[PDB]
Design a protein around this ligand. Sequence first.
Ligand SMILES: [Mg+2]
Ligand SMILES: [Mg+2]
Ligand SMILES: [Mg+2]
Length: 235
Amino acid sequence: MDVAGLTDCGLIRKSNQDAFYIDEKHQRFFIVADGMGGHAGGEEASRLAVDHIRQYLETHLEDLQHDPVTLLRQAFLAANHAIVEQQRQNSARADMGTTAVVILLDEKGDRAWCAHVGDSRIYRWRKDQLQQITSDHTWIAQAVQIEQARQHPWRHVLSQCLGREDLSQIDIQPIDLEPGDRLLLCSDGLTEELTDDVISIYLSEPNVQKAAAALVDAAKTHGGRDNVTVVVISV
Ligand SMILES: [Mg+2]
Ligand SMILES: [Mg+2]
Ligand SMILES: [Mg+2]
């Protein structure tokens, strides 16, 4: 399968606390993390999350692929710990944090595991049809399902994120992959500017490197309020 990643600061923020990583060699897992935190806390956080999940997976992939849930859950904690450790040290970054979305493909690339903590999403496109797999870990999001798409007040506050000692929710769930459909991993940066409609259109793009770029370009054109990162995987 063809995979492509691409990040970018956007049109406003001078820095970039987004991060991502693709397992180019084997293509077994993918990551994306939206970091937050003053004094370059966000960059540290997202990097830590990605490095730690990544390393943890490369270590117990063969060992626990028969049990993906434990694998992912454990990986996320490895990162959550890493981050929390940094908070306790550098006091300027006590409030650093990050989100993370990860996809873990089965040896036989037919099943796709989706783990996540935060408001970065995972989408599944199939035969001109986009579907959101993950559920934003936020209050207003967790208001609805008691509130309508009139989201706009506090709609930004996360309710979960790596880098909290009380971390109580690592959403892991499988989805079936039918040759042809596409997989997407993004950060609020994408979805805050583009609607699922627009997103679906660009994803239809046959070339993943073309889509990924179209996605980021599109995103920045609607405005670049946040750092945007996307990982497009064609099954
Ligand atoms: Mg951020
Ligand atoms: Mg958000
Ligand atoms: Mg963000």
